Amino acid sequence: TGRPEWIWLALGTALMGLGTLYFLVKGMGVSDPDAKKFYAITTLVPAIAFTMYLSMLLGYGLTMVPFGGEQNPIYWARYADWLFTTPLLLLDLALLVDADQGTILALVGADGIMIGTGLVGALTKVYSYRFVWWAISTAAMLYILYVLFFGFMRPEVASTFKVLRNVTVVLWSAYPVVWLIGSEGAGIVPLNIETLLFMVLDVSAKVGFGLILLRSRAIFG
Amino acid sequence: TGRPEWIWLALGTALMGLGTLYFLVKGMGVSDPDAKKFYAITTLVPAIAFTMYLSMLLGYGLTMVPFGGEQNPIYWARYADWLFTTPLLLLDLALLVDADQGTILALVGADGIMIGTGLVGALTKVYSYRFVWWAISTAAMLYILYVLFFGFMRPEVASTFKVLRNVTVVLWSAYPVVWLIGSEGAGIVPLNIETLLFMVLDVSAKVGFGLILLRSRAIFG
Amino acid sequence: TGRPEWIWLALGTALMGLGTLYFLVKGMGVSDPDAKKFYAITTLVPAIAFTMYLSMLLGYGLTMVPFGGEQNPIYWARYADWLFTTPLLLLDLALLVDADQGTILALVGADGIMIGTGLVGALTKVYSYRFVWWAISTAAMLYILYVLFFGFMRPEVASTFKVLRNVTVVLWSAYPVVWLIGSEGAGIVPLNIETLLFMVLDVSAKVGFGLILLRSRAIFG
Ligand SMILES: *C/C=C(C)/C=C/C=C(C)/C=C/C1=C(C)CCCC1(C)C
Ligand SMILES: *C/C=C(C)/C=C/C=C(C)/C=C/C1=C(C)CCCC1(C)C
Ligand SMILES: *C/C=C(C)/C=C/C=C(C)/C=C/C1=C(C)CCCC1(C)C
């Protein structure tokens, strides 16, 4: 199509689809309720991302937001994605360490705040205010990372939890930077490069994360 | 009103309302926590449908979607309905057989994918792509039906579960067909007939299903 | 800004923010899982309200709804707020008295119906129908209050539950009145006064309620 980021949307669509079918095949057989739980959550994540990548690819998850006296193309469908997939990823983590419900509610709630404010930021027509929403969203992220480190077993659990937690902090932290420097933000880095950055992070945080998780014996009772 | 499907919207509004008041009266008295659970879920379903039928009746849940070079009237409020009511119906089933949380999450998640993609399909302005969303949605449905049959007691539970599961597969399967042949799809069958088909399915899947369920002793500890 | 209700939006933004930081500091230290649960829920409430107050302040949560042959300014972001915060407040109550899941599902479901119909009412372009949605929403509220009184311990639990339940019925009941007499409704009381009324209720129902709750020992095992 007439959009140069189409290739990354198509590649992300493809990789999320393949990841979904892999984990779907993979989870065939599992009878342990606990593992079943990790398979459900972890397959749903790239399944959802698959549809939102397709929606961006086909142009449905794309809108135009006027700001800085111009018509800026915003892929809103990333937030419909993250809205659902980021809490699920946090659940994987939470279930791994047997977190209190209070801590899970704090994380999921913090998360919704993170994406929803990111969304508002993305759709806001007053340029300056866009970065107020960014700041609040980033504060929510920082709370989440705080909890992951100070708000929380079988060594297998701990070992896998430590790895995925590290994967999580490192990739999740890059998203505010990408946003801030890309088309939604200061407009430093073009949309096509921004889309590639998000595709590389999304596949790693979704399919990379799930591969690490689902190969672990930490998921079995 | 100037819409010939108004009669079916009015009749559905009426039947969902009556079903809600019946199950509300019916559940008065119930102290068994387990049955209480089935009453809550099963009353909420036509209550929600009642509001969405009223919203379509009054014209609020109706929008115009350009495709095939025409202004197509789409009742989007059906998806706000299903978004909430189809997972609840799946919960009735899941609680009946004491399903693992992993299986419940897979079903609810599969379900959201089903309706959300149906919604995107419904609102998509490129005619051809409408049926890509249909296909994905249908794949989600097929997964759900798979799980209902291969992903899962007191004989009462089994007996009622077997009946409602059969009701479920048969009516849920007709919805993709109706969509595909009606105004959202190929435009084979007019909107007023399509609305009647959906009203007959919705009342049967909601009020018919609940009557069968709530008369059963399968719902009591 | 050019809006005379800005001061109340700014004051609400401020008070919700301060309430969020107070309860966040306050909950530092808590290790009792049960109390943790009450801290999560109760901090999230004004956190969410903070963002929606900011969104109204900045003008993002404001839209124009034509009715009565005029362009009526509707703050839709109040419903995005309530959609999440009113169920959470009901959870605080529900967890306090150890409510059955059936009763919690009935309350949360009743609640979503309440706000969602309030939203539809708010955005409806046919003046008369606006009050049909109001009536249904009010019926949902009345059900909720019914349950709080007839649908349900340590004396501490009972004592705090009795107080907060009284706070709840009294403030929640004023919201339908405010709506009905203000800009969304009959247009009796101007928007700026309406916004002040909602700001006073919101801070009391959110921060006032949380202060009463979180000072109680009812929240600890
Ligand atoms: C499945 C994809 C994942 C793990 C995406 C994570 C996205 C975030 C952690 C986003 C955070 C952002 C902020 C902290 C600042 C504002 C903009 C956002 C939403 C990109
Ligand atoms: C309360 C009403 C019920 C049980 C409705 C069920 C609706 C479905 C099972 C819808 C499925 C569809 C597809 C599988 C294809 C795409 C379009 C849909 C959403 C009509
Ligand atoms: C955090 C704020 C709270 C507790 C807000 C509560 C709001 C309600 C109880 C709203 C109810 C309304 C109706 C019953 C009638 C229609 C309009 C509403 C949504 C204002």
Side-chain angles (χ1 to χ4, degrees), chain B residues 112-127:
Chain B
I113 282 174
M114 187 181 76
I115 314 302
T117 48
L119 180 55
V120 176
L123 298 182
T124 278
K125 305 190 206 191
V126 179
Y127 189 52

Side-chain angles (χ1 to χ4, degrees), chain C residues 42-66:
Chain C
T42 310
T43 301
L44 260 175
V45 170
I48 290 152
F50 162 73
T51 65
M52 290 310 149
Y53 267 95
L54 185 52
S55 83
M56 292 182 286
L57 178 57
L58 298 183
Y60 180 82
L62 170 81
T63 184
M64 295 308 158
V65 180

Side-chain angles (χ1 to χ4, degrees), chain A residues 36 40-41 44 51 54-55 58 60, chain B residues 100 102 105 109 120 123 133 136:
Chain A
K36 267 198 183 142
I41 297 176
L44 260 175
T51 65
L54 185 52
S55 83
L58 298 183
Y60 180 82
Chain B
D100 288 320
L105 186 44
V120 176
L123 298 182
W133 297 109
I136 291 142

Side-chain angles (χ1 to χ4, degrees), chain A residues 31-209:
Chain A
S31 75
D32 171 61
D34 279 72
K36 267 198 183 142
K37 244 191 289 185
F38 282 124
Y39 270 103
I41 297 176
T42 310
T43 301
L44 260 175
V45 170
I48 290 152
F50 162 73
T51 65
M52 290 310 149
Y53 267 95
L54 185 52
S55 83
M56 292 182 286
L57 178 57
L58 298 183
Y60 180 82
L62 170 81
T63 184
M64 295 308 158
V65 180
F67 59 83
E70 7 218 68
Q71 276 258 105
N72 309 268
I74 303 295
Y75 287 95
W76 68 257
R78 302 193 193 269
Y79 310 89
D81 177 337
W82 301 339
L83 173 57
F84 294 112
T85 52
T86 50
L88 280 160
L89 284 159
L90 287 180
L91 244 190
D92 264 345
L93 293 181
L95 289 171
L96 221 48
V97 301
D98 187 6
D100 288 320
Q101 310 189 172
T103 303
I104 301 167
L105 186 44
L107 282 164
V108 177
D111 199 294
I113 282 174
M114 187 181 76
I115 314 302
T117 48
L119 180 55
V120 176
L123 298 182
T124 278
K125 305 190 206 191
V126 179
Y127 189 52
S128 291
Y129 297 169
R130 288 183 79 85
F131 308 97
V132 176
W133 297 109
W134 180 88
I136 291 142
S137 179
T138 288
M141 188 190 73
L142 291 177
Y143 179 78
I144 293 173
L145 308 188
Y146 172 86
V147 171
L148 298 173
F149 278 111
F150 303 96
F152 290 136
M153 33 218 189
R154 359 202 295 235
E156 12 165 29
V157 177
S159 179
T160 296
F161 167 76
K162 303 258 223 64
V163 174
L164 292 181
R165 161 168 77 203
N166 285 323
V167 170
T168 295
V169 152
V170 174
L171 308 162
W172 289 38
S173 292
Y175 288 78
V177 182
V178 179
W179 199 101
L180 187 74
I181 60 193
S183 53
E184 263 100 280
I188 270 156
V189 172
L191 184 39
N192 81 113
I193 303 301
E194 165 173 14
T195 302
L196 163 69
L197 304 181
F198 278 136
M199 182 256 285
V200 173
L201 296 159
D202 288 338
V203 176
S204 304
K206 292 190 165 73
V207 182
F209 175 110

Side-chain angles (χ1 to χ4, degrees), chain C residues 2-220:
Chain C
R3 286 180 280 137
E5 66 269 16
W6 84 261
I7 189 29
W8 316 125
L9 300 176
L11 220 206
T13 299
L15 301 167
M16 295 296 188
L18 279 46
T20 305
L21 301 168
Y22 178 66
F23 300 143
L24 265 174
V25 191
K26 194 139 195 311
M28 315 183 57
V30 191
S31 75
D32 171 61
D34 279 72
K36 267 198 183 142
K37 244 191 289 185
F38 282 124
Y39 270 103
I41 297 176
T42 310
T43 301
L44 260 175
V45 170
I48 290 152
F50 162 73
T51 65
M52 290 310 149
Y53 267 95
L54 185 52
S55 83
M56 292 182 286
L57 178 57
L58 298 183
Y60 180 82
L62 170 81
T63 184
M64 295 308 158
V65 180
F67 59 83
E70 7 218 68
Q71 276 258 105
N72 309 268
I74 303 295
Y75 287 95
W76 68 257
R78 302 193 193 269
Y79 310 89
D81 177 337
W82 301 339
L83 173 57
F84 294 112
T85 52
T86 50
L88 280 160
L89 284 159
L90 287 180
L91 244 190
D92 264 345
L93 293 181
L95 289 171
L96 221 48
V97 301
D98 187 6
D100 288 320
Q101 310 189 172
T103 303
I104 301 167
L105 186 44
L107 282 164
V108 177
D111 199 294
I113 282 174
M114 187 181 76
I115 314 302
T117 48
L119 180 55
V120 176
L123 298 182
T124 278
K125 305 190 206 191
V126 179
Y127 189 52
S128 291
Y129 297 169
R130 288 183 79 85
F131 308 97
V132 176
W133 297 109
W134 180 88
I136 291 142
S137 179
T138 288
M141 188 190 73
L142 291 177
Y143 179 78
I144 293 173
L145 308 188
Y146 172 86
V147 171
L148 298 173
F149 278 111
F150 303 96
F152 290 136
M153 33 218 189
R154 359 202 295 235
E156 12 165 29
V157 177
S159 179
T160 296
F161 167 76
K162 303 258 223 64
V163 174
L164 292 181
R165 161 168 77 203
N166 285 323
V167 170
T168 295
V169 152
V170 174
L171 308 162
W172 289 38
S173 292
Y175 288 78
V177 182
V178 179
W179 199 101
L180 187 74
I181 60 193
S183 53
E184 263 100 280
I188 270 156
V189 172
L191 184 39
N192 81 113
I193 303 301
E194 165 173 14
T195 302
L196 163 69
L197 304 181
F198 278 136
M199 182 256 285
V200 173
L201 296 159
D202 288 338
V203 176
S204 304
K206 292 190 165 73
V207 182
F209 175 110
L211 283 165
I212 297 163
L213 175 56
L214 289 194
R215 289 273 218 168
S216 163
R217 210 57 180 191
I219 61 163
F220 286 94

